[PDB]
Amino acid sequence: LEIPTSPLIIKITQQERNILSNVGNLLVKAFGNYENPDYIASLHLHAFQLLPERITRILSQFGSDFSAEQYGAIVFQGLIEVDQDDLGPTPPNWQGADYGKLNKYGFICSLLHGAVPSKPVQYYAQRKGGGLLHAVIPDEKMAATQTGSGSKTDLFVHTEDAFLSNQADFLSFLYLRNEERVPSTLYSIRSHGKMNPVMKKLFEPIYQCPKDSGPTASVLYGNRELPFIRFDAAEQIFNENAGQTSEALGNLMDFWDEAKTLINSDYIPNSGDLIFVNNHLCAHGRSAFIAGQRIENGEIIKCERRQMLRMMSKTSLIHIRSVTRTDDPYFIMEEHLGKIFDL
């Protein structure tokens, strides 16, 4: 067995970039925006017929691959060319993001999910939905917070929405700018190799999964030999109010001791790179940084602040139907491990 220790790196070609750009422009003209219900209803058809064939091939293989060799993450290097002057300055927070300008990017991202095949969704748990595409921008007000609006966060990893029974199946992180040169940290449950006694204890449904007395869940699930994972190191372990039992905390600490040595922080994304993640296999994180600066040869180089676009998707609308809005089967109303928001 070749135990995966790093994600698959795909170097996007100029011809592929040009196709994505032209297709993105055509979809903007045809449908106005990526949230158009006519576009969403025919998403897979546009994904398989408009994407560069190599991307379609990679994503289709990835969607059904839960084998021992699968890391659960793909880095698409140079997926898009970002014109930095046209993008202009990074807004102070995510509320300031111009969606007229990210519209083409939303089409491209939604086609990638569509080729898995997977359906872009939104969660009331994250920004009261906030649309299919989220701008992730470091806010000075929330500088050292354990969120996406954060800047100084270090050594931790998490799968997205570990507190939800219906968390995303697939995630995409499109980097518009990373002038601070912050590494993108990834962690795969497949990096452990063969099922061992430390991992086996995580199948027990005894762990707290606190929201971004509570119900418990298993950290490991799915296949017994090649499992899926729901994990949040900061929220389940290093949170004083996590409320874990001594048995559960001990199991998580033993797991974290093994897991932390397998974290991969080698990849530093460039503008236009997209990281595509199987949220059931691979956890993600970000190293500490001061937004709007980098240090080179003992000197501070001022720069525009970090800017990333996030899209989440589910492979089945049927199995999430008891937690979605009556008039919107793509809008998840789940609050915490089965419990729905009481509005």
Ligand SMILES: N[C@@H](CCCC[NH3+])C(=O)O
């Ligand atoms: N910026 C995002 C990040 C949340 C997910 C990562 N903890 C938000 O405010 O919803």
Ligand SMILES: N[C@@H](CCCC[NH3+])C(=O)O
């Ligand atoms: N969502 C992160 C950045 C993405 C890193 C994922 N490897 C943030 O706090 O901005």
Ligand SMILES: [Fe+3]
């Ligand atoms: Fe996250």
